């Protein structure tokens, strides 16, 4: 029997809000280490890696490893049924055919309990630049550049980070410079200059995880796909991997 109880239950809601638009069905790895997910998107161009460590949960028990095939949209709806301040418990048997979601109330007078059905889905350091910026600012830049073109050139040097886009109506570039504050500051760790090109649609998909964290981390290098990382509040992390265009 697997049982995970988490007081801050909004975290799950936010995670699936970030994921429902990217992956339709996915296999959750349930272990003594926590809740994990590794998957491609429906268009097979990007990679999503979600980690929620067991220590971050209020109660955690995982007798056997579980490979829960889940339709992320259905689970997102069911989590929509939960209140933002509810306590969320995920429960499964060793033969995980049903998943149980328990939503607890303030004065223990409302107790929602939903049961999903799981499917038989088999589960399947080089970096020159690291930018830490506000998650809202990254989402804003992605949304803004979406109007200009389909591909974004991210340039990273010791002077700042630039997001450029070109398309039918013209071009456009945004320049973020490091600040003096140093979750509202922009910080650049550049060990080698970097100039790469990525699909803006997938970046806008990644930015759906903005409510999970106030800061986003863009880890960039010429030979590896970009990593967009959102750190949760003292729990796991959501990492998106997107290959640079040739």
UniProtKB/Swiss-Prot annotation:
Swiss-Prot/TrEMBL GO biological process terms: base-excision repair, gap-filling; cellular response to hydrogen peroxide; cellular response to UV; cellular response to xenobiotic stimulus; chromatin organization; epithelial cell differentiation; estrous cycle; heart development
Family annotation (PROSITE patterns): PCNA_1 (PS01251), PCNA_2 (PS00293)
Record keywords, A-Z: Acetylation, Deafness, Disease variant, Disulfide bond, DNA damage, DNA repair, DNA replication, DNA-binding, Dwarfism, Host-virus interaction, Isopeptide bond, Methylation, Neurodegeneration, Nucleus, Phosphoprotein, Ubl conjugation
Positions bearing N6-acetyllysine: 14, 77, 80, 239
Localization in the cell: Nucleus
Post-translational modification: Phosphorylated. Phosphorylation at Tyr-202 by EGFR stabilizes chromatin-associated PCNA.
Stated consequence of mutating residue 219 to I: In ATLD2; a hypomorphic mutation affecting DNA repair in response to UV; results in significantly decreased interaction with FEN1, LIG1 and ERCC5
Outcome, altering residue 158 to R: Abolishes ubiquitination. No effect on interaction with SHPRH
GO cellular component, one term: PCNA complex
UniProt key word Metal-binding: no
Cross-link (Glycyl lysine isopeptide (Lys-Gly) (interchain with G-Cter in SUMO2)): 158, 245
Cystine pairings recorded for this chain: 129-156
Keyword Zinc appears in the UniProt entry: no
Consequence of substituting residue 202 to F: Alters chromatin-associated PCNA stability and its function in DNA replication and repair
Other facts noted in the record for this chain: Antibodies against PCNA are present in sera from patients with systemic lupus erythematosus.
Function: Auxiliary protein of DNA polymerase delta and epsilon, is involved in the control of eukaryotic DNA replication by increasing the polymerase's processibility during elongation of the leading strand. Induces a robust stimulatory effect on the 3'-5' exonuclease and 3'-phosphodiesterase, but not apurinic-apyrimidinic (AP) endonuclease, APEX2 activities. Has to be loaded onto DNA in order to be able to stimulate APEX2.
Subunit architecture: Homotrimer. Interacts with p300/EP300; the interaction occurs on chromatin in UV-irradiated damaged cells. Interacts with CREBBP (via transactivation domain and C-terminus); the interaction occurs on chromatin in UV-irradiated damaged cells. Directly interacts with POLD1, POLD3 and POLD4 subunits of the DNA polymerase delta complex, POLD3 being the major interacting partner; the interaction with POLD3 is inhibited by CDKN1A/p21(CIP1). Forms a complex with activator 1 heteropentamer in the presence of ATP. Interacts with EXO1, POLH, POLK, DNMT1, ERCC5, FEN1, CDC6 and POLDIP2. (Microbial infection) Interacts with herpes virus 8 protein LANA1.
Protein name per UniProt: Proliferating cell nuclear antigen
Organism annotation: Homo sapiens
Gene: PCNA
